[PDB]
Amino acid sequence: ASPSSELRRALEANEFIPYYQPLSPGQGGRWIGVEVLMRWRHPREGLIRPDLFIPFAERSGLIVPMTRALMRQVAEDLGGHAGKLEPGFHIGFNISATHCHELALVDDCRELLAAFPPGHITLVLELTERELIESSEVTDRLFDELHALGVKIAIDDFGTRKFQVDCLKIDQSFVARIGIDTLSGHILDSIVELSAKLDLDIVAEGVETPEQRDYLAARGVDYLQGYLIGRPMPLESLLSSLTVQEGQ
Ligand SMILES: Nc1nc2c(ncn2[C@@H]2O[C@@H]3COP(=O)(O)O[C@H]4[C@@H](O)[C@H](n5cnc6c(=O)[nH]c(N)nc65)O[C@@H]4COP(=O)(O)O[C@H]3[C@H]2O)c(=O)[nH]1
Ligand SMILES: [Ca+2]
Ligand SMILES: [Ca+2]
Ligand SMILES: [Ca+2]
């Protein structure tokens, strides 16, 4: 058995599926978007998490097609059900540093946007800070062109350089320590105040407890994500939950 053959095969056999984690407003309410998380439906080994296969997809370069396959799948999955989505519904995708080279990404974004009514969803791309240090100001007509389509850019796992981004996502590690560490609390308050100075939206990730939600809401964190709001879930659970939310 070989890792490369297995992934390359799995992509052709459509074994990489989207799971969807909902985002909620900081002050609560209906779901305003989802983060798309990759899952490997392995026929032998079961449902396999990203951390056991994304690193090799990045080294081998195969994540770029995998992400394209995933974006296409999301358009199939949700393009027909646009009526169930609140206006400006956020759909986020995790993107690599290898994606940031050159211009294909723009085609894929235009393709996804074309599956929905114009302006009805907001497409978001999440990059970590560490993934931006490969080229920091060069072939970045890409970000200009992506923004011209109304695509937004989010810094993933923030807190764990000079752009050109619309949103910060507070890493789980900060949210985990809310209420039991004044230092981390002050640093988290700094990140939140920075986002407001720079006019960037902010999402908190890993919101598990009501203590955490209230703390973040009291400081105007725009959006929440985590097990409190809902775990990553298959297409069907999402459509079922969104159907309920159309009622009242
Ligand atoms: N403890 C805790 N964990 C929570 C909570 N809410 C969500 N999570 C987990 O946090 C991860 C999402 O954060 P991430 O920074 O994108 O971290 C992601 C992301 O870096 C990467 N990844 C996932 N899908 C993709 C993809 O399509 N492309 C790329 N390049 N990377 C991906 O794999 C990482 C792990 O993904 P998952 O295993 O799905 O792990 C998910 C999810 O299961 C919570 O309340 N508590
Ligand atoms: Ca993410
Ligand atoms: Ca990533
Ligand atoms: Ca994170």
Author numbering: 5 to 164, 173 to 260
Direct quotes from the study:
Ca2+ is a well known inhibitor of EAL-PDE activity. To better understand the reasons for the inhibitory role of Ca2+, we determined PA3825EAL structures in the presence of Mg2+ or Ca2+ ions with bound c-di-GMP. The Mg2+ and Ca2+ complexes show metals in the catalytic centre, annotated as M1 and M2, coordinating the phosphate group of the scissile phosphodiester in c-di-GMP. The Mg2+ and Ca2+ metals in the M1 site superimpose well between the two complexes. In both cases, the metal is coordinated in an octahedral geometry by Glu39, Asn98, Asp130, Asp160, a non-bridging oxygen from the scissile phosphate (P1) of c-di-GMP and a putative in-line attacking water molecule. Significant differences are seen in the positioning of the Asp160 side chain between metal bound complexes, with the second oxygen of Asp160 contacting a peptide nitrogen atom with Mg2+ bound; while the Ca2+ bound complex shows Asp160 bridging between the M1 and M2 metals. The M2 metal shows octahedral coordination for Mg2+ but trigonal bipyramidal coordination geometry for Ca2+. Mg2+ is coordinated by Asp161, Asp183, a non-bridging phosphate (P1) oxygen and two waters. This contrasts with the calcium complex, where Asp183 is not involved in coordination but instead Asp160 and Glu217 make contact to the Ca2+ in the M2 position. The different positioning of Asp160 and different coordination geometry of Ca2+, together with physicochemical properties, thus contribute to the inhibitory effect by calcium.
DGC domains containing the signature GGDEF motif synthesise c-di-GMP from two GTP molecules while EAL1516 and HD-GYP171819 domain-containing PDEs are responsible for the hydrolysis of c-di-GMP to 5′-phosphoguanylyl-(3′-5′)-guanosine (pGpG). Hydrolysis of c-di-GMP by EAL domains has been shown to require the presence of divalent ions, either Mg2+ or Mn2+, with the most efficient reactions occurring at alkaline pH2933. Here we report as yet structurally uncharacterised EAL domains from the core genome of Pseudomonas aeruginosa, PA1727 (MucR) and PA3825.
